[PDB]
Symmetry: D2
């Protein structure tokens, strides 16, 4: 028996990110060695960071890291993993038997399907779909996992047996970035009609991106607001 | 549906030669002067053994790759490459699926355990038959979701990781060597890696094409233990 | 016996860069295998490249390379080597006796000096500045080069003798990028009031950038034109 | 003007421990359950050695270390060739340069290299130190004197600096993860015992040594493995 889930989760597992890190790093360029010591307050912090954001001076946002634990279907992990300045370590289906958790969209998700990303007329759907999707998914997931279990039972290599598993199978990974890589990622992986360049990601990676953005907002409140302020363009 | 076991790589564009390496390396010792066969062979052997990899980066190779998604995930972990890949969010995907061929060992059960490696050919028929039921049902349902007006990006959730995809993949020679050290199983190498056979097929095809472009670099690569400089 | 020059030179030595490669790379997404054997006409090329440029879809612009031979002052080479997606190989002063060639800015250049980059009110300059710079530079360079040779004559290692040499000493290097990295470089290393983000690079690095742009314009005229139509923002 | 021979590195921030390695590696083999349970020094060391010996590099990337570095420009150029790092450096286009310049100390000059990579080109002596100090003093004094005359003439900071030598001190922040740091140590330390002998100049190697010490304090199991296996980055 399989488990169907529709939750996509991100947990902040570790970090070293602050708005002060950014101020210090940027100060060294005009201040020299005073940089590491100086008297910088609430209003000077806002001012400097907004300025770096508006000028796209991005390197001072690199002196940090945030590490997330992500649990998501493989098709969404494929989206996250396209971001080449991040580091990733993922559960391996060559090394382990895969758990029978599979992703299905929730009812309320399906009313926001993008038939051809970037085109307005292709957004829509309604919730007779959800039952049809649940019904199709259940049949395909069951068979795949049963054939999966069957080959493992004959002693077929796990890396071969998994060929039958759907891209909706859940995976778990660690994902580490600095703030600049995170802002570049948010620019592409959130849909924000406010933004200078509006992106059209699938909703499931956007779910990942929003949770990450919430955790990041707490660590770097001033950077986060400035990022939104300047049109969600990565410095 | 179609079942297939080809995994193909074609070189589609390049600007890559051994001489491009020699010139790049020679600005250092010679300056402007830098812009035979034995000084080329010599210089390249030295850069390889000293691990001066920067001269090997002044070049590009582009490949067109046809492989199932699980192997494409392997390829796309190499972050210094450039990729563009067929999208199931935009396209209705083709009913082509990978199954291993007859000569594939079917029993590495934990890679790096050359105690967990083996196989037979009654395993073959089992794999094919069993994958076939999985793929058939997945595709039928993928079609029924499309036919009900479900968006492509959602319909595809039911497709296995053995679905064929296709992409352009571009690297310089230094990134390729790094890729080859990880993505071929070569007990003769200084550091032995244990890649899945399917990505290794990709890798062998790329190495073969690259040997035609840069045969002296390819020889030095192997001579010094298949360690990327 | 020193030589003063004020020419910063870029030569394209090799490339494999075209607009058509960009189209193929984008078409694989929507057309699959067929993209590799498709024929593309002028208007479909233009429409597609302008679409990617304005949408900031940048990956299709990476399947190429350009290799430049660059001769420039150290201080300008440092600007150029800040760009981490490039490949560089540079003449070594640890290995080679350095040539007596040093950069001075020419008279036209000095009219457009940047006192506080980004601040337009420290932009400017006089006509007699050229003579004061030349008289000042020539004295300092002569002494550095003379001490350099003295150190070399006393058997001091080249790696140590060169500490007396100025940031205006000429170096030579190969610099290799793809068009996307070149574009991000041009958005930062050229000053353009038309641009969506006006940058304030030292004129010396900008001279490097303009010549790269000219050579690249010839290889990928469609992309070039599109990059400029949409405000010099790197996809 | 002030002549110095110190090259300093200070750790100003980090999030790095051997623990972030074990967790990142454990996800692959034990899934979700690798964030959340049984941890053991022996098994932690055996896993880190195994990743190191096998060059499984990626689990060593979930961390960061930020160094504040003060070093002459010619050394900064060596450090900044490592493109996986992030840097922010004092700008001479924005700032009047301080007249601090590097001269090698007396012991260092006894080493000097070549031609780097040839054993028989290493040498020096202690009236050579006084040559170096005297030539340097003459060059730097004139450079700084011209620098000032140009600034006094209202010539722009960015142009005036053309006269200053590559021995001018600069200050920067440098952030990397432990995988990038290992690669940098492999190339920027000279260790006849390593699987690959590298021949960096002494000054960047003085930067490297201090970074290694600071890192080893944070990740001693990783550092012991790095060294045990020939100082090859995973
Ligand atoms: C047998 C095998 C098993 C594997 N097992 C797993 C697994 O179980 N789970 C999993 O997630 N992955 C696994 N991987 C994938 C692996 O962790 C890498 O993602 C992939 O192999 C490519 O690694 P790479 O970074 O060395 O090369 P690429 O990312 O091209 O990077 C090339 C080199 O670039 C440098 N580099 C680039 N970016 C950085 C950076 N940000 N920091 C430091 N250095 C950088 C490094 O020196 C690196 O060696 C496995 C790979 C193999 C061959
Ligand atoms: C709506 C949407 C649609 C997409 N469509 C497709 C698709 O149809 N097909 C497909 O294959 N992918 C697609 N992608 C993925 C896309 O092609 C990117 O690889 C992904 O968005 C990550 O972007 P990136 O390459 O800008 O950033 P990452 O690879 O981190 O790189 C980040 C930034 O680093 C720089 N950079 C890193 N490496 C290089 C390099 N080698 N050269 C130059 N600059 C570099 C660039 O400035 C880049 O913007 C899509 C993404 C979105 C949000
Ligand atoms: C003794 C010595 C002598 C040297 N001689 C010279 C010289 O004469 N001239 C000169 O210019 N430099 C010289 N260098 C500098 C050298 O060429 C490198 O720029 C510097 O050593 C940083 O090394 P790196 O590129 O391997 O690592 P970093 O750039 O962190 O890169 C780490 C790893 O990332 C990967 N990587 C990152 N970007 C790319 C990319 N675009 N393509 C492929 N892989 C990538 C590679 O796998 C690389 O090894 C020398 C260095 C040493 C230690
Ligand atoms: C007018 C001007 C003023 C400047 N002022 C200063 C100054 O005062 N002090 C100073 O030190 N420098 C200064 N710089 C240099 C600047 O900080 C950058 O190093 C330089 O512009 C290189 O471009 P880049 O860092 O945006 O991207 P480059 O390193 O090419 O990289 C391209 C893209 O790759 C991505 N990327 C690559 N590596 C990482 C990583 N490790 N983490 C996250 N993302 C990554 C980013 O998305 C980045 O934009 C200035 C440049 C200009 C034009
Ligand atoms: O040999 C491997 N190659 C590889 O690239 N991975 C990466 C790919 C993917 O992001 C994740 C899991 O892959 P498998 O499910 O193929 O292990 O780790 C893992 C192994 Br083991
Ligand atoms: O929104 C997208 N996000 C994405 O990352 N890709 C990348 C991921 C994968 O390597 C390939 C195809 O993905 P889909 O099958 O998710 O389109 O392109 C494509 C699209 Br469209
Ligand atoms: O040991 C070296 N370290 C180094 O980083 N380079 C790089 C730095 C610079 O960009 C160029 C030449 O510097 P020297 O002039 O410092 O060799 O090559 C060269 C040598 Br040799
Ligand atoms: O316009 C700039 N371009 C640049 O690349 N830098 C980087 C390069 C160098 O590493 C450091 C100091 O450069 P000047 O010394 O040119 O400011 O910051 C700074 C400025 Br401002």
């Amino acid at each position: 028996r399989i488990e169907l889930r529709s939750d996509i989760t991100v947990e902040l597992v570790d970090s070293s990110a602050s708005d002060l890190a950014v101020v210090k790093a940027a100060r060294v360029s005009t201040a020299g060695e005073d940089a590491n010591d100086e008297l910088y307050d609430g209003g000077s912090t806002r001012g400097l960071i907004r300025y770096l954001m508006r000028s796209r001076h991005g390197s001072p946002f690199e002196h940090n890291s945030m590490t997330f634990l992500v649990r998501a279907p493989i098709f969404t992990v494929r989206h996250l993993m396209r971001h080449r300045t991040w580091s990733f370590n993922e559960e391996s289906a060559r090394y382990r038997e895969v758990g029978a958790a599979f992703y299905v969209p929730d009812a309320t998700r399906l009313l926001r399907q993008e038939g051809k990303p970037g085109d307005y007329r292709y957004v829509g759907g309604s919730t007779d779909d959800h039952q049809q999707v649940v019904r199709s998914a259940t049949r395909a997931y069951e068979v795949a996992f049963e054939e999966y279990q069957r080959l493992l039972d004959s002693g077929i290599a796990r890396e071969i047996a998994r060929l039958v598993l759907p891209v909706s199978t859940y995976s778990v990974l660690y994902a580490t970035c600095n703030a600049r890589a995170l802002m570049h990622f948010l620019s592409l992986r959130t849909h924000r009609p406010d933004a200078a360049y509006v992106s059209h990601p699938q909703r499931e990676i956007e779910m990942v991106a929003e949770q990450m953005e919430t955790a990041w907002a707490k660590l770097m409140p001033v950077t986060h607001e400035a990022f939104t302020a300047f049109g969600r363009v990565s410095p």
